[PDB]
Amino acid sequence: FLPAAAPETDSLERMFLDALESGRIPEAQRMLSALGALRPSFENTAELEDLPLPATLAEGPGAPRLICVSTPTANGGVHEYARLAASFRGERHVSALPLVGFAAGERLPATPETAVRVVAESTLRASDGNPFVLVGHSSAGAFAYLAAALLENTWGIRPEAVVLLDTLSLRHEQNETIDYAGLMRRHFMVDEVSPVRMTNSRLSAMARWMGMLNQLEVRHTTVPVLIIRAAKETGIYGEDHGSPVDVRSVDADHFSMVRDDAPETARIVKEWLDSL
């Protein structure tokens, strides 16, 4: 609930936010990219001291447990799934995972497969040998889907399901299908109290993680998959997909679905989860 410190005048955050405010998206992006390129990398998860650590956000008797993956945004983190987890308090366990590289002097993944890999392992630590559902908002969805598929292919472990909260793509290829530019504006122009500053490490991590979306290795997971679509933004999956993929609509936008319209989203997730 407590606000992080406001951005200073000379801060990267402010310069960044001012650039978005004044519609200078490409320039802001190029700064991020140039900054992100200086960050040090890691190629294997063994080169990591410890794996990112999960935050428990709700506890409960059970069903499958919910493991949420943070969005690769500079203001992202475990706190992003707290309202959502509030609707599950006392019913089931809900964790969230930070992404590696957003905390100062964490190295970033060197490659998209390493990125998927670290999310997958850290998802496993969080499962603690239980049966789990991977959740991911927006592009965290893409990392959740693909981490499910990596778990299946290389460790023969299988989530009960994967939930995508308005995930718009996997690779997020910049190609006119969606205003990616306007979505970035809207995200960072959302008006709420964040518990984190957009540090230089978090902004450079965002660039690196977002930059890897375009080069992700696409891989199928057989486990069931729920896409909750947000109706305020506005028959592709059947028997021929090779696995069940359901699409539910929610009366919410992309942002409101994990915020004020979160309890709807949670309930659509509950309904679906037990109908499995």
Ligand X SMILES: C[C@H]1[C@@H]2C[C@@H](O)/C=C/C=C/C=C/C=C/C[C@@H](C)OC(=O)C[C@H](O)/C=C/C[C@H](O)C[C@](O)(C[C@@H]1O)O2
Q: Which residues bind ligand X (CB under 6 A)?
A: 29, 32-33, 71, 73, 138-139, 172, 174, 180, 183-184, 187, 206-207, 210-211, 213-214
Separation CA 251–CA 257 (nearest Å): 8
Structural tokens at position 36 = 């992100």
* Residue 5 interacting with a copy of itself (CB under 8 A): no
Task: Give me the 140-179 binding string for a copy of itself, x by CB under 8 A, dash otherwise.
Answer: ----------------------------------------
> Which CA distances in Å does 275 have to 92, 114, 133?
16, 34, 14
* Residue 271 interacting with a copy of itself (CB under 8 A): no
CB 154 within 8 A of CB 275: no
Q: What is the chain's length?
A: 276
Structural tokens at position 235 = 């028959």
Residue 194 binds which entry of a copy of itself, ligand X, none, CB below 5-8 Å type-dependent: none
* Residue 122 interacting with a copy of itself (CB under 8 A): no
Using the rule CB under 8 A, give the single segment among 14-22, 111-119, 216-224, 259-267 that binds a copy of itself.
14-22
Cβ burial 163-192 (10 Å sphere, 16+ → b, else e): bbbbbbbbbbeeeeeeebeebbbebbeeee
**Range 185-214, binding a copy of itself (CB under 8 A):** 199-201, 204
User: How near is the Cβ of 244 to ligand X at its closest, in Å?
Assistant: 25
Q: Which amino acid is at 140?
A: A
Q: Classify residue 42 as left (phi > 0), alpha (psi -120 to 50) or beta.
A: beta
* Residue 79 interacting with a copy of itself (CB under 8 A): no
Which one of 3, 4, 21, 37 is in contact with a copy of itself (CB under 8 A)? 37
Q: Comparing C-alpha atoms, which of 15, 23, 30 is closest to residue 186?
A: 23
Residues lying near a copy of itself in the complex (CB under 8 A): 9-12, 15-16, 18-19, 24, 27-28, 30-31, 33-35, 37-39, 104-105, 199-201, 204
